[PDB]
Amino acid sequence: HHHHHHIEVLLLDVTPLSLGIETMGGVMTTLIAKNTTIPTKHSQVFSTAEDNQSAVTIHVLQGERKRAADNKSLGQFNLDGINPAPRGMPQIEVTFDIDADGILHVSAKDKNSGKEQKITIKANEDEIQKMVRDAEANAEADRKFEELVQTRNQGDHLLHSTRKQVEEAGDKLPADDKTAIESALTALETALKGEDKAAIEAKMQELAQVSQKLMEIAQQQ
């Protein structure tokens, strides 16, 4: 009683360690997780970290730790030529492609300009298990580090965008709100220098709660 539309998985190999890139704050962002079946192709879209940034550096990493510096370095390259735009607007697609020969191809492409750059990384046993074990021993500190960096980066963006809004609003912003917002901005700046995720979240919320008039002001444009 057979049917004839079935699809079969081709199982040739799996990756021994995670593969990814370094991102803002010294974090390893994974593109291909440990144990992914190969051949495979994974991409994710990234952006710039400051206004009018013209280039990014892709640092290719191998390992299970969240701090980039605690992983193995496989290679690096730049993608130049990113057209001037606000932080976070350019769309840079980073693709990790592993072929049947086990060769890793990494590329970064600007989705807007089409500019592309790429590298090829050519295809341990006790070192692998050592690295897996080093990660388990630091799993808690690594999670806390990753969450802190994410929170800091979100807080830095909010700091910068809010200051920009204050400047554009000018005399349209009531003095009481401006005082409240400036105080909240300074408090968030101080929190961002620390290592306490909860304090940064609280200062971000305290800032949003006093900044509601900025959005309304922008709309009268």
List residues near a copy of itself by CB under 8 A: 1, 4-10, 12, 21-24, 29, 33, 37, 39-50, 53, 55-58, 78, 87-88, 91-92, 94-95, 100, 150, 153-154
Cβ 40 to a copy of itself, closest distance in Å? 5
Strand-pairing partners, residue 72, are 62
Report which of 127, 141, 149, 175 is spatially closest to residue 49, judged by C-alpha positions.
149
- The sign of the torsion formed by the CA atoms of 188, 190, 193, 194 equals negative
Nearer to Ca ion, 5 or 122 (CB): 5
Contacted entry of a copy of itself, Ca ion, none for residue 10, CB cut-off 5 to 8 Å set by kind? a copy of itself
CA distance 64 to 76: 19
In the chain, what is the straight-line distance between the N-terminal and C-terminal CA atoms, in Å?
Answer: 68
Nearer to a copy of itself, 53 or 138 (CB): 53
Cβ 122 to a copy of itself, closest distance in Å? 20
Phi (first) and psi of residue 125, to 5 degrees: -55, -45
Contact residues: Ca ion, CB under 5 A: 6-7, 24
Report which of 94, 108, 120 is spatially closest to residue 32, judged by C-alpha positions.
94
Nearer to Ca ion, 26 or 84 (CB): 26
Cβ 58 to Ca ion, closest distance in Å? 9
Nearer to a copy of itself, 86 or 177 (CB): 86
C-alpha distances in angstroms, 50 versus 38, 84, 102, 110, 145?
35, 10, 36, 16, 22
Contacted entry of Ca ion, a copy of itself, none for residue 122, CB cut-off 5 to 8 Å set by kind? none
Number of CB atoms found within 10 A of residue 23's CB: 18
Cβ 182 to a copy of itself, closest distance in Å? 22
Nearer to a copy of itself, 49 or 180 (CB): 49
Cβ 1 to a copy of itself, closest distance in Å? 6
